[PDB]
């Protein structure tokens, strides 16, 4: 009964078969794989996995490949033992991978480092355990003045809020990755750490070269660049994922909140899915149960119109993965039920219409013929009480609905008159269960037109 | 383009086909035959000269045939002199139509004066000019005492105000003329002096009985019971002649304007079609412009919402025809012009939402698919600013269809499915002259439902 | 109780106190004195009588001073007799007042005839019985062609539609009736054929130099300048009345009704009185019952939503002014009570939300601490369900606040603090009989203001 | 510029003079005292200090007394060594208070533990670390099946989920700090454990006999009972604090934010104060700056409408105490700028109106005449954008307006009438330095009518 879908990570704990039966009844729609870890072996006997259950049982999911992107990582200490920083003392960065360090220096990753920085800026380390601020600049060396206590171990992420880094794109190892995800026929991709229109080009260009040209773009938006951009990003992104972890060590505290309302909002009326990720039930990779807040932040992303929320560790690595996802399903339910729909170009004009009519004549059931996943995301732009039919011929749209709140999918063999879709329309709607005999649904397509517009809208009684 | 019709009533100044043509030209959408005049070869004559101006010329009009009804009137008078009654004195009505009269007692043309009327009833005579109040009923006489001085002449109306008259739905004559207008094919038939449901349907079964269950019954309201009885009325009609002057001497006369105004709202809401006739531009029997009053009344009909407005002597006898078609569609132009819609079944649903979208995308056309009027009806309901274009198989709902307000009816062979319906809507909206390549236009019909079902909206580009 | 105020006008069957008294029962708020005929002693003997009538019965009235005006006229005839004119044939005017006039030429009162015209102009005579038009200007001379046959008689009327007239705006005889009208205090001075801003200035001037600063002006709309400079007139006037038969006249007759719309709905918005004027029920001069398109003329002219309505000759000479009176309130009466509020300065602010809590507490009385009528008027413009009662120290504002609609007067000696005026207000609410105890009153006033600002609303239970 | 409030518990590191000024100055707006810890000597203490800082700065603050309230506590065990309950095991509670316990056995403090379970019942402990299952109750032991396994201390708290619990509703150390509160005139005593209407008015009574008649009761909803009882609770109450920590081992967690949303609606409706309370920005015990979803959390808080929110241990014990309450105030003040008023009897209909407008006239500032403190909540109902400036004679309201969003009290000497509320109210707007010359404010009070009704509002420029 729950409209908002689940993105669930998968790993060792998780890749069986029977595993991911069980998880798909407790809510799984769709399976993240995290390309932070594993290799092409593990990611493509999940991918085999998946499709079988899929085969077997008939249900539906999708797949969603997570690169994991470019970063700067701190390196090596002297035996390898961690160094206790001391506010106040002197501390530097070299860009020279070289060093292996120890109390006063140690090397980074990204040869930028000097580039892109400022006598002025911040650099958080670890995320952010550490808080330095840069105090001179000088060949290859960053030097700073720590801020606070800590202890420095090896290989630790660094973090420059509100500074544009020039990494690239897309790392060496994400464009292999991608590669493999064409081959795989992956439904989507989630690209991290993207920062600006330009981005998201290069990847689509490198998915276009590998015949990837109808896999869906997520982009992560991870920092303050990102937020600037966020505009241009969505226009060329198929959707966005919100990285509230990543945000939380990149901007001020109290604004990570409004970024969320902000970005999922615009991916609402820009008809764009929208996945809210990191830090939802964390507490679950060790206890049977959340936390409170950890329900309450659920829920809340779901209250600001998230179309799915994702489980990371907790469903991947986690002792209780199977609690995390039907907490979250349970979770889902009881905050999607009391939702209210928001009525506020053709599209826009008979899609707002047609679920307006669908609520005026209590309709359980608005069906949709799909080119494309436009038109269907166009009716859940207004969050319908009813639920979405989507048939679409095409099957990667088909999984790719799979994502969008309130939607299910189905394939047909064809439609071949407007006549038709209404027959085939109210049989399909029969026999999914969601409508039954003297129910009202309204019925939604093309007709004369070329598609992705949708021009008609028609009722009919079971 | 006005949208409220104009009904012209034809006599022998405007009957030639010479004269029709330029009525149509001035703004004439019907044809009235006022079967209190003439006989059946002139009216059969003018039925055949507009249908070959109707031929040669491609426009469309309606013929309404309107009959003389059943009526109470006074008899003979001594010498055939007026006598002058005195206020206060002692009248007395005797239904022996033998009686010549005088200034102590006339006779009336109906028997059931006596049963109908009671001790303490008004009677009304010559449009009101003599009020009398009925002080005893013995055997065959209704014995009064005169309320007001006034003259009597012979052969003058009766009006009962507040009492039910008994008399028959139909005259003899009504009858013979009933099956003459089944002959000749009319569209529409006016009943007179219509006062409850059963009147309504007397007609229908005389209709049925000669070949004229296809003929749209027109009732005329004219009194108190009439109104009393509106709703039953209604529903049994398939519309409403407002008989204003009528009204006036029935009911009190602060009330006919509600009257009016209630009677209108309600055929609007029933989507039965409404005419506001009697007393409309008089005064150009004799002059070639109107009255300031005159041009007010009228506008405030079409400001009530009324589908049309009659022309009665003016275009049938008066030295002016023309000049009153003319300023009267001026009237209607200028009058329309300032119309509003007016939003708030699945049909209701449906051509609600048709027309507000209509609007939100500023177009210039509803095409309707109409299987008979109740769907073109159904839009009309709504007072579109878009021109309603009505596509119909059937000849006589065409010629019906000009009745209806801001009404376009056309002609087709067929529609065999709802693709073929948006097609040929497309050509025929172009061919109209209504609108222009670019344009939206609104299309309306019904898909896999019973006819006088509207479940479909569609939105195209011309 | 109705709403909407009636003007009458005085004549000599309605002279004596005896006929006013029985005139105010009936419903009169407002004596009109029409100074085109009359003497200075038979209008003061009038203004005598109601100010009798008023201090015996203790009910309030106004008196309204309505000038003659400036007047183009054609002059005398050959033997008196009248002359036919025929269409097509030439005929001149000229400013030569000794010329006696024929068939072909005749004299008019204004020498500025020749200047204001110009070739291709309309001359209208007679109330637009015989049309003209310029066929060229020649010394004292306008030559035409006469339009239309009919017959001229001596001393008529002519009217230059859209032709601005260099008339003054007194007359000679108006100057010294207006000296008349200060010297007597009337309340309100209606100024005939106002067409400019300068007239309604130029009548101000003469009245405050003769003490009449405080005589309201009510502009009579009469002719197409008059409607093209309306804004310009409103805002100097400090009301209008709208000249219905003259403006058919000289506009053309389909947009006389919505001159009458657009004047009435910008005198409610600018918080100034509107009467509506001529051709009300003319025939009741004759007749004891009016028509039925005279009672729906009225009534729609109260749904336009204007203050008062006037009776002219119906109540100065006619043969049932008491007859006309009532039938008039009858109307007002039954229209009145189908009128809905109107809800759209801090005055505007305080006032609308006085009526909508008014409404949301079902008060009957709206209690308004008026300075001068601005305050009163400010309430009224939203057409509250609630009366009126407009506390004021002045006598002459109590007068006139008795031609707004709506509102009932009441002199207070004093009001010293707005607690005060809350204690008294309650007290003359309950006194009034418009409330009761338990009743809501909602109490309008201005606090720590200058005079003519509103920005206080008190909720009261009596 | 914040409006929602700040409660800010008191403890060893932030009771001296000095720290309670800064914490003042960072955004604390009422003194928490947990009397779950501390003598009557510490909490006078810190009552003079604050006091103290109240006097020398002029600034106002308003102290609470939260009461320990009854619970059901484990007790001791063998050597004091914590055991380690099994899944599967039998464990058994005694109400023995002389058992000292084991891996098998333990003493409750409540004697009522056995009569107000069943078989079948949950019983938790510790928080909800253990969770057991009743299967026999005998005698004065309840047996249970351990669910979970965890380690079991000494002196840990038990929940019984969903179970009426007949604990009293004052512990006796409850009733002897209820005679502190008003010994120290205290403003607010939040009540712990409340769980029906009868809870509350013991409370009233026993504060009413040590004339704490004017001490605010808050009541703090922490389990099912208090939830289904809670429309009664909130009837009795001055106010809400809503314990979601409690309330997530209670009740179902996906429910605990739909309870907190509940409840602050209908204490705005009821025009009662709201606190959100537990599980803020408790990392802050132990960091500088809160988590991303710490800050979710309170910000989603002030979203729902809550009043006030509260510091426990982080402003108490807590490492970074001033931190904590100046991301706090941060947080409150990025979440209020973006908050939107919400328009949607006497009082009501004025207030709201008031408010309404305020928004209309860009008014800064709504001025409350308030008797007691009905009249600014009920302003404050409604959201206002301008801030309630609420003007009292009575030092406690003063006080206890502190707590409600939006509100600046003010203490005056006294008003002796409207127009002097209207004089003094301008003056103490311009000294407030809210709002400047030339602003609107609207200013509300209740004239003629007993206190704590509302019925006048009036608008003026400053």
Redesign the interface.
């Given at each position: 009964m729950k409209k908002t879908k689940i993105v669930c990570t998968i790993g060792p704990k998780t890749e069986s078969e029977e595993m991911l039966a069980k998880m798909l009844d407790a809510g799984m729609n769709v399976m993240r794989l995290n390309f932070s870890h594993g290799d092409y072996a593990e990611h493509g006997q999940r991918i085999q996995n998946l499709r079988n259950v899929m085969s077997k049982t008939g249900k539906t999911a999708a797949i969603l490949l997570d690169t994991k992107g470019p970063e700067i990582r701190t390196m090596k200490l002297e035996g390898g033992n961690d160094v206790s920083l001391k506010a106040g003392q002197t501390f530097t960065f070299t860009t020279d991978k070289s060093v292996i360090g120890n109390s006063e220096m140690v090397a980074v990753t990204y040869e930028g480092f000097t580039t892109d920085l400022s006598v002025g800026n911040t650099v958080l380390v670890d995320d952010?355990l550490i808080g330095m601020e840069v105090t001179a600049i000088e060949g290859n060396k960053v030097i700073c003045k720590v801020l606070?206590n800590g202890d420095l171990g090896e290989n630790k992420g660094v973090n420059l809020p509100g500074v544009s880094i020039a990494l690239p794109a897309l790392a060496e190892k994400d464009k292999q990755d991608l590669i493999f995800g064409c081959e795989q026929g992956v439904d989507f991709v989630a690209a991290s750490f993207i920062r600006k229109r330009s981005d998201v080009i290069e990847i689509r260009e490198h998915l276009k070269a590998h015949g990837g040209e109808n896999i869906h773009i997520i982009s992560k938006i991870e920092n303050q660049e990102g937020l600037n951009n966020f505009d241009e990003i969505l226009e060329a992104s198929d959707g966005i994922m919100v990285a509230?972890?990543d945000?939380?060590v990149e901007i001020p505290?109290?604004?990570?909140?409004?970024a969320?309302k902000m970005m999922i909002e615009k991916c609402i009326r820009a008809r764009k899915v929208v996945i809210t990720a990191t830090?939802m039930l964390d507490s679950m990779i060790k206890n049977?149960?959340?936390?409170?807040?950890?329900?309450?932040?659920v829920?809340?992303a779901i209250l600001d119109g998230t179309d799915a929320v994702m489980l990371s560790g907790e469903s991947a690595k986690g002792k209780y993965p199977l609690e995390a996802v039907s907490?979250m399903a349970?979770?889902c339910e009881?905050?999607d039920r009391?939702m209210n729909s928001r009525l506020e170009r053709?599209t826009e004009?008979?899609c707002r219409?047609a679920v307006?009519?669908a609520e005026?004549?209590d309709a359980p059931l608005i069906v949709v013929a799909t080119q494309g996943a436009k038109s269907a995301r166009a009716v859940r732009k207004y969050f319908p009480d009813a639920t979405i039919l989507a048939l679409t011929t095409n099957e990667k749209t088909a999984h790719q609905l799979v994502l969008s709140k309130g939607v299910v999918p189905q394939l047909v063999k064809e439609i071949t008159?407007?006549?038709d879709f209404?027959?085939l329309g109210?049989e399909l709607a029969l026999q999914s269960g969601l409508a039954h005999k003297g129910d009202?649904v309204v019925m939604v397509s093309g007709?004369?037109?070329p598609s992705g517009t949708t021009?008609?809208?028609?009722?009919?009684?079971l």
């Open positions: 952010g606070n509230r972890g945000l939380g505290v109290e604004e990570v909140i409004f969320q830090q049977p149960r959340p936390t409170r807040a950890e329900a309450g932040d829920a809340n907490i349970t979770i009881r905050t009391v053709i004009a008979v219409g307006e009519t005026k004549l008159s407007t006549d209404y027959r109210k009202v007709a004369l037109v021009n008609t809208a028609s009722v009919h009684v």
